[PDB]
C-alpha cells in the first residue's frame with residue numbers, strides 16, 4: 001503493498017462525488033473523465049491548484065456503496081470529444097461544466113457498511129458516506145476511507161506518481 005497508494009494520498013484533498021447512475025461511472029472508468037455542475041467545477045478547479053493530489057471518491061446514488069476513487073489530472077476544460085453521459089430528464093449538455101481528466105486509483109467497490117467507523121469533520125462528523133455531491137472529506141477521514149477499498153492490482157501507481 002500500500003506504500004505507493006499512501007504516497008499518492010499524502011497531503012491530498014478528497015471529495016465525495018455522486019453519480020445519478022452506474023452508466024456515468026462506467027463511462028468515467030472507461031474514458032478517464034468526469035464532469036460536474038458549475039458549482040462543483042469551481043470547487044474542484046480551486047482544489048486542483050491547491051494540492052498535490054485531488055481525489056474523487058465516487059458513489060452512485062441509492063447504491064449503498066462507493067464504486068472507486070480517482071485522482072484529478074487536469075482542471076476542467078471544454079471542447080473535447082463529447083461524452084455521451086446519461087443525463088437526467090430535463091438536463092442538457094449545456095448545463096454541464098467542463099471535463100476533468102482523471103486517473104483511476106481503484107475501480108473496486110466498497111460497501112457503506114465497511115466505512116461506518118469513519119466520520120467526516122467537514123460534514124458535522126456524520127458518517128463519511130453522508131454528504132452532498134461535492135462534499136469535501138477531511139484528510140485523515142479521506143485517507144482511511146481510501147485505504148479501506150480492496151486493492152486494485154490492475155493499476156500501477158508509478159505513472160500517477162510521476163504526474164504529481
Ligand SMILES: CN(Cc1cc(=O)[nH]c(=O)[nH]1)Cc1c(F)cccc1Cl
Pocket residue numbers: 017018019020024034035036037040085086087088096097133
Ligand atoms: C457527467 N455528469 C454525471 C454526474 C452526476 C452527478 O450526480 N454529479 C456529477 O458531478 N456528475 C452529468 C450530470 C448528471 F448526469 C446529473 C447531475 C449532474 C451532472 Cl453534471
